Amino acid sequence: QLVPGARIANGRYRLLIFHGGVPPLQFWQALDTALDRQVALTFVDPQGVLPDDVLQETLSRTLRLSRIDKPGVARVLDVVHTRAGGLVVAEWIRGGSLQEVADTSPSPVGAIRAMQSLAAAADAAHRAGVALSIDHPSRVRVSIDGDVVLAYPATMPDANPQDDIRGIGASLYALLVNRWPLPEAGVRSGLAPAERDTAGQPIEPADIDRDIPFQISAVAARSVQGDGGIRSASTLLNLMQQATAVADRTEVLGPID
Template identity: 35%
Template sequence: MSTWPTEMAPPGRGTAGPPSPALLPGGMVGDGRYRLLSYSGTDARCNAQLWRARDGQLGRDVALTVLLGNQADARAAARVRRTIERAMHAASYAHPGVSRILDVLSPGNGIAPREQVLGIVVAEWTNGTDLIDLIADGPLPAATASRLLEPLAAAVEGAHHAGLVLGTEHPQRIRVTPEGQLRLAFPGPRAEATSRDDVKGLGAILYLLLTGRWALPGGPEGLPVAPIGPNGSVVAPRSLHPMVPHSLSTVAVRSLEDTSVGGIRTGAAILQVLDEIAEAEAETGLIPVVAEEPEDDVVWTTQRPVKDKKRTRKLAIGVSALAVATLLVLGWIAMQVVGFFNESNTKGDGGPPLVISQVVPTSDTKQSVNNAPTPTSGPVKPASVSVFNVASDPDSPNKGGLAIDGDPNTSWRTDKYLSNFPALKPGIGLMATFGQPVKLAQVVITSPSAGTKVEIRTAASGQPQLQQTLVVGSGTLASGETTIPVKMASPSDRIVVWITSMSPSGKLFASQISEVKFIGAR
C-alpha cells in the first residue's frame, strides 16, 4: 500500500490515504478514461474519496466520487450498488445547487476487475472553492451564511419532492461557486441515507458557517467539532457567538435534532427562516456595499466594514462646501433676475429685452430636447436570439428564440430565484444578433411579468462581457406590451435586453418575455 504524500492532506481535509497505488494524482481510473488531478477529501462513512479528474475522452474536468473496497466483499458491494442506483435516479434532477451527474461506473461497466474500486459517480466539475476553506479565517456573518445556503436548501427541498436523496451531510462534498452559492459538488448519497439526513446536513452546514465547527459524526479529521451541552444536544450557535440571530441559531440546532423531540423535518422550514433573514438584510442593510474594487479571484468579503472617521469627516466637509456653493449660485441668479426687472421699470419700453434663457438655460428645456422621440422606420427582424448570461447555468438557454417567434403564447422564462437580482448574479437577458448593424428607435416587449425592470444595451461583436455593453434605454414592464425608447449614437449588430430586476411571485422571483420587437430609427 502506498503512503499518502503529506502535502496532499492539509489539516481539516482528512488524512486517510488511498488503498491503491492508482489513487494518486496522475493515476487513471474508469478503464483509463479519467486521470486524477487533485484530491478534495474523504467521506469515511462510506469509504469514498473525492477527486477532481480529467475526462480524457471529452477533454473536460469532472468531479469523481470514488467508492473504494474489495470487489470480493459482498456486503460492501451491495451498499455501493445502492449508492450507484440512487445516483442514476438523481441524474435527471437539474438544479443550480447540485452538480449534474454525468455518468456512473461499476465493476464490469467502466471499472476494471483489478481495480480496488466498487463504483464511481461522475459529475460536472464545480469551479470555486471548498466549503471548509471558506471558513478558514473564522465564522461568517449571519446574512452571508443565509445567502450562501439558500440555493442548496432549495435543491434539497426540490429533490425531496421528486423522491430523491442527495447526500449533503459531509462538508467536503460541498463547494462554493464563484457566484457565491453552496453547491453539492460530489453527489452520491450513502446507501442508508434518508431525506432526514439531507435536512441534518443543511443544519450542520449552517452551523459550520456560523461557528466554524462541524456538528455531525464522520466529519473530516482536523475540523473542530461542535460542543455538546448538558442535555446532549449541540450548543446553540448564539451561545458561541451572540451576534447570530435567534431564529437562525434555533433552526441550525433543530435541524440536527430528532424529529420526535421537535426537530425540523423538511428543507422548506429552513428556507423560510433563510428568507426572513434575507428580508431583514434588505430592510436594515446588514451588509453594506463595498466601494473598493475587489482583488483578483476574490468573490466576496466576509469582513465587517470598518468605520473610517477621517473619510467621514472629509465627506462632511465636502458636502457642506457643495451646499454653500449652491446657495451662492442661487443667490446670484436671484439678484440678476431682480436687477433685470428693476432696470425694465426704470427705462420703460426703450430698453432692449433680455432673454433669460440665453443666460441660464433651464433644465426643462434640456430635458425636452434630450427626450425628444426618435422617428421610427419600422420593425427590424434579428437573425437570431440567444441567452446573454454572465454567470454559470444560463436560464432556459434553448428557448431564447421563443421571444422572436411571433407567437405571444410562447415565452422565454428565467429560472425561479429565492432572491431578486443582483443578490446572486447581476441579471440575465437575451441578445439579438442582426445580419448588419442597425440603429433602433424603440424596443417593444410583450410580457405578463409586470414590474420587471429591463435595460436595452448595445454589445460588441464576438462574446461580449457585461461591462463591454452600453445602456441605450431602460424601463419597467407592464403586463402586456411595453414600449421602451432607445437612443443610439451609432448602429450595432447586437442588442441585449437585460433584466436587472425580476417580478415577485410569492417568496420567489421570476420573469418571462413573450415577444420582443425591434423598431428601427430613420
C-alpha cells in the same frame, strides 16, 4: 490504491487531489483527459467490500438525483462501473470546499443566503423520491457565485431526508462558527468538532458569537438537533428564506423610471 496521478476508466480520468469522504466513498478532484477540464469524482466502493446489490442501488438512486436540475446539486455527467467499483462523475464546481469557506468567517446573512441553494435542492430531491446524502462536510462546496452545492453526489440505500435536514443544518452551523456539530465519520474534514453544552448538545451559534442574529442561529440549531421541530426540506427552505429577508438589505422605492 487510489492515489493522485492514477488513471481511471481506461485513461479517461487522472486523479489530482483527494477531498475525503466517509467510507466506503472517496471524493476526488480529477482531470478529464479527453475534454481537458476538471471533474468531480465519487468512488463508491473501490475495494469491493459492499454487496453487489448495495452498489447497484447506490448507482440507481444516484441517477434518480441526476434527473434534477437545481443549482444546489452538481451536474452528474456519468455513472459507470470501473476497476474501482462504481464511479459517479460530476461537473466541477469553481469555488472552494465548505471547510475552506467556513475558515474565512463569512457574514451570517451571507452564510444563510448561500445555504438556500442546498436546502432547495434537498426539497426538490426529496419530492423526486431521493436523498442528497449530506453525510459529511466534504460533500459540499461553495461556488464563486455563492451557492452551497453538493459537489460529490452518491446516494446510498441508508440515506434519508431527515439526515439531509441535519446535514444541511450542520453545513450552516459550519459557515456560522467554523465547527462541524454532527459526529465526524471517515476522513476528517478539517472542521473541529463543535463545542457542546453540559446537556450534550452542540452550543447554539448565537451563544458562541452574539453578532449572529438569533433567527439565523435558530435555523442551524433546530435543523441539527434530533427531536427538533423541522421535518421537511420545504420547511427548512422556508425558514432560511424568512431568516434571510429579515436581515436582507432594503428594497429601494422611487418614482417611475
